[PDB]
């Protein structure tokens, strides 16, 4: 509806992409925080993450909470097909 002003230094489309990436990354961060805070003190994933032997917080977040945004060339999954990412989607679907 053209209610989004273009952020200084970026065009409208890049501003929208930044907003979407911010929302999805915030969601991934909060979901991962919730998953980490829900790990039992006996958890082997948590034991290895706190030990630092092999693992990371994002690994627990992906194996429990959400895998997250998938990026190709630093942007979201590009519109390889004609205005659609896969045939199963409608054209100009920028949804997550």
């Amino acid at each position: 509806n053209n209610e989004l002003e273009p952020t200084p230094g970026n065009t409208l489309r890049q501003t929208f992409e930044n907003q979407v990436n911010r929302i999805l990354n915030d969601a991934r961060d909060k979901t991962g925080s919730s998953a980490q805070k829900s790990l039992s003190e006996y958890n082997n994933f948590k034991s290895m993450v706190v030990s630092g032997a092999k693992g990371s917080k994002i690994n627990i977040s992906q194996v429990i909470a959400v895998v997250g945004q998938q990026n190709v060339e630093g942007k979201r999954i590009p519109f390889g097909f004609k205005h659609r990412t896969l045939p199963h989607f409608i054209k100009d679907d920028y949804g997550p």
């Binding site: 060339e73 519109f79 390889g80 097909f81 659609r84 896969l86 045939p87 199963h88 409608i90």
Partner: protein, 538 residues
């Protein structure tokens, strides 16, 4: 072996070249002769030539085959007998009521304002050839031969075909102008609808054409050296069977595709040895695709997994190392079109309305769709939706159109492309009519009794239930992943599904289908397993 899809117009944009937008067409005469004789139509950047370009970037030029330097496009058009600039524009611009395209093409006309006759234009082309002729007649004859035979042979190579060549050259310039104005997306590089796979058929044909040419050359040499004496001539003695036998044998054995004497210039890595460590390895080797691009390239784009590989190439199976993304493996359902002569489709189109390019006024082409068959522009049509419905009906019932023929209706660009070319990669998708599958319970009932009922896959396809969809018809197809969740009414997302997938597990290839619960793994681990399964032992 992959190759760019011939007989198509692709408008690219080089990064820093002297050309801004370049439309290239690789033209082959139904694979009957010659590898390919491409044609370029570029737009000469923004920097002017001193005193002619003073706008945003103009002066369309044409790079013809067997011409040392570039030729302005208007000269090429006039060389085909279209002297008047209105006729040339009518071939280029389809509706003069759009002043922007006219403003974009005007400086190209201003470049060729000097040349104003057919013969002088042909001389202009000829004098720039490989070796200029001493006289005017030789230059004209050579220019005509270049224009007819080698420049765009797929549209035609028989004399009077100059009007068809003019229309197709105008189509290339029109695609170029669309890209320049921005009304068309620049054709995706790695888009898989722009790629054809040469299986053993086309490759052995490519070698056999050369070896038969050689056998004929040797037999003609033998006969000529035996006819100066004038005694007699014997074919059995003159024919050297070693040519065909040893050429095919060497090309399949060593892997260097071509003549033995040209090993360095020949393609290598084709015709490998079937690795027999594991059964999965044998299957993966028999179903493998090889992008011919050099493995030393540092550009990431030709190695990335394009979206168009969905259901055609395994998203996971690719060898690690410097050959990643360039050696690919087929999905389970992928089928490569074997070829079909496009005589019935042309006959049906001519009989079922359609107006050929010769017998239509150029002003009527703006509002009509353009029917392409195997890339050659066969004509225009006024009621396109009915044509697509009828063509789909024919293909489903498999009467005039074989099941491997693809039909695409570019609605936003008023084009219809029909492909019978061998090498297209297609997958079988269930047909969705209204919001329900055509795959009713009766079909599964007859397939459960597959034995002693003579009901097979071909009966299922011939009953209009499943349909082959290639990569560039998959764009105009809205696909339901599964029926039980997408066809049914809910908070509606799409109510116009045109096909449905049998099972989304057929995207994965042969070696990646052994992975249990692959959707839970990280994808690189699936690639590592795809590599490792061929090395397993059994």
């Amino acid at each position: 072996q992959e190759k760019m899809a011939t007989n198509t117009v692709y408008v690219f944009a080089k990064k820093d070249s002297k050309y801004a937008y370049t439309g290239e067409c690789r033209s082959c005469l139904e694979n009957s002769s010659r590898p390919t004789s491409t044609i370029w139509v570029s737009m000469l950047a923004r920097g002017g030539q001193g005193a002619k370009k003073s706008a945003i970037g103009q002066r369309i030029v044409a790079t013809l085959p067997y011409i040392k330097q570039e030729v302005p496009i208007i000269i090429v058009f006039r060389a085909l007998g279209f002297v008047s600039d209105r006729d040339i524009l009518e071939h280029i611009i389809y509706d003069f009521e759009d002043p922007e395209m006219m403003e974009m093409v005007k400086p190209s006309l201003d470049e060729a304002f000097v040349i104003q006759e057919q013969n002088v234009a042909l001389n202009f082309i000829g004098s720039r050839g490989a070796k200029p002729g001493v006289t005017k007649e030789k230059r004209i004859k050579y220019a005509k031969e270049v224009l007819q035979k080698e420049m765009l042979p797929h549209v035609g190579v028989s004399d009077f075909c100059e009007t068809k060549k003019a229309y197709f050259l105008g189509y290339m310039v029109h695609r170029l102008l669309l890209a320049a104005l921005g009304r068309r997306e620049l054709d995706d590089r790695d888009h898989y609808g722009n790629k054809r796979l040469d299986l053993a058929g086309p490759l052995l044909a490519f070698l056999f054409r050369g070896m038969f040419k050689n056998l004929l050359k040797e037999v003609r040499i033998y006969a000529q050296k035996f006819i100066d004496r004038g005694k007699d001539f014997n074919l059995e003695l003159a024919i050297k069977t070693r040519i065909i036998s040893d050429g095919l044998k060497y090309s399949l054995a060593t892997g260097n595709w071509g003549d033995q004497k040209k090993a360095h210039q020949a393609r290598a890595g084709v015709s490998q040895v079937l690795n027999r460590l594991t059964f999965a390895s044998t299957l993966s080797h028999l179903r493998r695709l090889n992008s011919p691009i050099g493995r030393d390239g540092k550009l990431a784009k030709p190695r990335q997994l394009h979206n168009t590989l969905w259901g055609m190439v395994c998203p996971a199976e690719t060898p690690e190392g410097h050959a990643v993304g360039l050696v690919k493996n087929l999905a389970l359902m992928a089928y490569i079109s074997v070829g079909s002569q496009p005589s019935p489709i042309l006959e049906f189109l001519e009989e079922w309305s359609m107006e050929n390019l010769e017998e239509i006024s150029p002003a009527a082409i703006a509002d009509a769709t353009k029917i392409f068959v195997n890339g050659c522009w066969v004509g225009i049509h006024k009621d396109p939706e009915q044509l697509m419905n009828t063509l789909r009906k024919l293909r489903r019932q498999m009467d005039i159109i074989v099941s491997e023929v693809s039909m695409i209706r570019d609605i936003r660009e008023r084009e219809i492309r029909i492909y019978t070319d061998a090498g297209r990669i297609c997958r079988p998708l269930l047909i969705v009519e209204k919001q329900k599958l055509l795959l009713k319970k009766r079909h599964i009932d007859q397939l459960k009794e597959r034995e002693y009922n003579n009901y097979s896959w071909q009966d299922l396809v011939a009953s209009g239930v499943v349909e082959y969809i290639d990569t560039l018809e998959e764009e105009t197809v809205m696909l339901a992943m599964t029926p039980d969740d997408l066809q049914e009414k809910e908070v509606a997302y799409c109510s116009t599904y045109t096909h449905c997938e049998i099972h989304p597990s057929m995207i994965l290839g042969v070696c990646a289908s052994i992975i249990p619960f692959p959707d839970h793994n990280q994808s690189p681990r699936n690639t590592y397993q795809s590599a490792m399964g061929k090395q397993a032992m059994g």
